[model samples]
Target: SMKAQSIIERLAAGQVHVYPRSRHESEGTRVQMIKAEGRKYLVAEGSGKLYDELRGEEADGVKLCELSHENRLVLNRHFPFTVPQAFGKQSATIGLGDRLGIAGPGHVQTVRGRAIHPILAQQSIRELALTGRDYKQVIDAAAYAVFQEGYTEGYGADGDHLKKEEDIRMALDLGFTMLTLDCSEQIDNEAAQAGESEVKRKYEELPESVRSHYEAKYLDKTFQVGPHAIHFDAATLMRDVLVYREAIQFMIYIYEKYIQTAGRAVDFEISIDETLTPTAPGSHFLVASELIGKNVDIFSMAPRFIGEFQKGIDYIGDIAQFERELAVHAAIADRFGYKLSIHSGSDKFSVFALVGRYTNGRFHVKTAGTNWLEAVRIVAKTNPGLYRRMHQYALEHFEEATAYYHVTTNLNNIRPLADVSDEELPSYMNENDARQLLHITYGLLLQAKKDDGSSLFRDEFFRTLSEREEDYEAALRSHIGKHLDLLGVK
Candidate 1:
């Protein structure tokens, strides 16, 4: 955070733009998507003179797409805005937006088992390279955009989750770096340990039928960590220490190999995203050594949580292992020579303070989509009609769920609308409402898409406005702008 005095001085004084000579060039028709008037609308009427990529509308011109670069999304093209036109038609049609949860493409099973849920596979995945149009023309336009946009905008890209070796490579070829391989998917410790105990408690109690099945179908994978317990390790994670380290190494191997083959002399970082409690440490420190041994970077990822001096708060670890786990990455940092990267690094409060003290300036923070979050608010305040529809949609659809959103502070701070009745709610709240609800809920409205491809509030909210043309244009503008915003169209 900048100091108030400094900020005030800067605000009061004439601001200067120190434009770089060869970098940060802005491109495309400045398509700013915002909930304006009563619905979302574009800033400019058409692509105008900018290289249009609006797909289908030749008047729209060029459609642009991006690649994911690790935890931090970087724009794909490397050439500056002055790059030659010959490089334009080089990109192949690879649907990444669909992978990034930008659009609904395929489904992945959630924890609800066979009953499938929309497990945030990807976001902002749409119209990769404007597939419906000519490929070379699109690629050339993408290259030009890369040159122009790269100088002006940072890299705009997408990422993958629960990916294995090949998946990591694919996203990389398309220029992505971050790939999460959910190791816990196969590691079920308690069930394994319980089985070990049961085998000892009563050899016969195991039931010969069960024993025979194991003997007949036993495979190397059968020795997995089990399902019913937190984890397995006799030395209170003594065995775990080694196994966990090895598991992390497997993914590192895939990542490192890609960097090696790229022939590009750039370094890469591996951010272990901590989602579950049990493996947070190994997840954090798991590959620090491998990365260090191979001379790689390390980043730590998790939703920003504001809490007690988090560094001092009790962690989800046993006292002894907690101590070991806490110190492992730092110890590796000392040994490996890599800065700690943090994901979702905002509003973590004490998290950054402690991290600063812990690693000093050995920190690299990644923040994207935030400026857009701020931009959305700017539009909301200016466009009351968009605000009213957005507020109303949220008020009616998220009645019971408002609290769990983790962002909104005061319910009344939010102004409601005449959308939901005691019994009747807007018809198209859930699916369509997503475009508007994003203003208040941040990324939380994603909860609307459950494993069953169902959303109670979001679709109807937007659909209602769509069916009613008074705000239809604004609504469409809002949808297009989100992708443009994510695409880094400032």
Candidate 2:
């Protein structure tokens, strides 16, 4: 009775704030979002047989579980929905890549009550390498956040832009529900530019059976997809075959070996968005048709859309032209019974409505670094000194980042930090050149170190964000809310 009184007193005195929705009376457990000093922890408190399964520190007949991987495993056993699940053929989905792991709750906040489902644990191999986190850590962060928020509708974890078989197996083995297989390395971009004689030579070099099969299937054939009719001429068919044949074969091998035998539902996405040129409507049709002919089950496909989808900026191109091409791309996806995935999909405000209208509310849009930029914005407002240091670092190291991404950022455009006041620092994020500078330099910024080998920006950066958690949450909710609203996600 005294122990019960102590628990009651602690709650009444505001020493513990329990997440009301996280309570599981049948299991005698609940999650608490506790803030002690300057740090916050999602602590699980419970008792009895079920609660004993969770590994944690105990006190006064109650278990207090920290948000560790071991504890996450136990939590998933009790609340299975907290574990990531495969969102197969969901009508509308958004992949929110949380680089810092703290943004999951905020992402969940924005997507809650909306018509769209969320792939909350989405990370590319490059991102994982840059951030120094593995797949298990990424998934654990999202799972704990979901438990703390009590969101149980369902979510997905993606092995984004995976090109290697070993990396694909790692993600699948760790319970990732989605795989975005990037096929750019296998694509022959040179075929698109080769002279007719060279193209003919390359086409003739293929085996008799392969060339005969493709020519018999697609030569001089008109495919009617949606309201559009796609016809390929001799030169175009040969070029498409040269550009995509090897990539198509690679997709078939991966699908049959990994995805088909995974023994569970896996949302497979073929990503060809990493190429040098935009994916033409004809090329899109050829790839989709070939994969379907091979009986490869694809949940979504990302073809590089027309114009520049540079990091952390609005779409840069003729809007009318973009809409025209997007309509045909959407038509191809519709004809093939899969959703069109938009990669590098952050901050493409100018084309969101067009994508929504064209895809007719069925699509998968992925946004990664935009969330990191939002965190940067929070720092600009809360800690001006830190923001100035980060901005200067980004400017100096912007060129290194270009090796990984394609952005047309000119340093001449960004006003010197000294020229802008603290009040004006946040507005810099709205500027084009400034946004790209910061967006591309995230890896360098996070990995910078001092002479003693301690983190120069990473530690203090996360500290500021954690201390101002609600501010960061509000920023993400508003910023990402705009993205969804513009995409017409009701």
Candidate 3:
């Protein structure tokens, strides 16, 4: 009781970074709480073990946790956190990906008190598994960061790249306000090989009811989408239908079943960006036009542009081509009044200016792995021994990690980890191949195993970053600021 009061009194002048828990657990007198300045300590009585041993005390449950700034270290439950509407907003926003759950504070620090809206709690189901975390942990991490920074202005939580009903249910239950439905798998990538006849055959299989409806709306119909007039010729219409028919069906099903009855207003995003073939501008127009025709309340759409959006690397296609196609896609999105979401958008500086200019600051760009790269950046700078080990480990496991990603990195292109000294390791982040090598292998390194069932890299990696919190924050601010600057966010 004294500890609780002490914590409250300490923050009486009102500059608390994180909110202190007013109630304590009653575990048969095994724990006591105490506070000083702005830090809170939970003491375990008589052989009670600490919940967090990485940064808190382990003996007798005497866990010394600072309630502010260090969001990853402090664990708070049941805070009244809000997940803001990410789409249909008037301004541009960025999704701040936090794989390790520790980057939330830095993310907020970068976007807080600023005009841009930040999706602080952004992660995919794949990221959750690879990082050994859950959606609840993600929301909690973000909530704590906002609390720590006293950020009363709203933020958003995105269930990034979600596809299955099970994953969508999990994220919704965890209070994720925005759901990006990844319909990449449903898209018929075989069309390129199968020719228009095969596409016609597949199109013929659609139910008469659906076929008649689409035909009446689309066949030989010159539709106006944004600034461009999209008149689908029979061949073009067939191609678009073959490419996105299944994906559109999946989107409609997902919307009716999950998104509509989500109780709260949720932003729905239709994503076809993870495919081998880039989404043609006409294809993008067809999907959005049909969905709007079907009365789907989608907030954004992720179109696979005519460029390489490789992870941890810059844009990989002709800028002129990208700009030309993106303008049409932006126009389509504008006609429907939904933002065009860019996936795999991390560190793609060359295209950010075009994305800003064409969309006119009405876009939603989703980035993940780049945040993890910044964390590793700290590792390479602060703890050279561990950094060298992880770099070598990343090289060893790069191929396996690339299975879930599309990267153009060649091992030979990367400077050998053996050749680079520890001091020079941080500079490798700028190297195209080096960043790719380390970027894809994050999961393998974090989940590496030894005989004792302990991690070889996870603990050391996070601890190293935690030790350099200030540097990490500064790096994130500068790097993310660059992104916003390119996007022309005010």
Give the best candidate by lDDT: 2
Residue-level lDDT tens digits of model 3 in 94-126: 889888877877788888656778888899888
lDDT of 2 by residue, 1-490 (tens): 4543444456547786565555554256655655444544444455555567766555555554556788778767777887888877648999999888889989988998999988999999999888888899889978877766778888899999999999999999999999999999999989877898899899999999988898899899999987899998888888889988999999999999999999999999999998887899999999999999889999999998888788988888898998888889999988889999999888999989988998888999999899999999999999989999999998878788899888888889989998999998999889989889988888899999999999989999999998899899999999999999999999
For 325-437, candidate 1 gives per-residue lDDT tens digits of: 43444444544455444443322332434444444434443332332233333334344455455455455655444443223233443223554332322222322233224
lDDT of 3 at 258: 93
- Candidate 3, TM-score vs. the true structure? 0.85
Ranking by TM-score: 2, 3, 1
Ranking by lDDT: 2, 3, 1
Tell me the whole-model lDDT of each prediction, alpha carbons only. 0.33, 0.86, 0.76
- Evaluated against the true structure, the overall lDDT of model 1 is 0.33
In model 3, what is the error at residue 170, expressed in angstroms?
1.2
Candidate 3 all-Cα RMSD: 6.4
What's the CA RMSD for each of the models? 15.9, 2.6, 6.4
Which ten residues in a row are the worst by lDDT in model 2?
Answer: 35-44
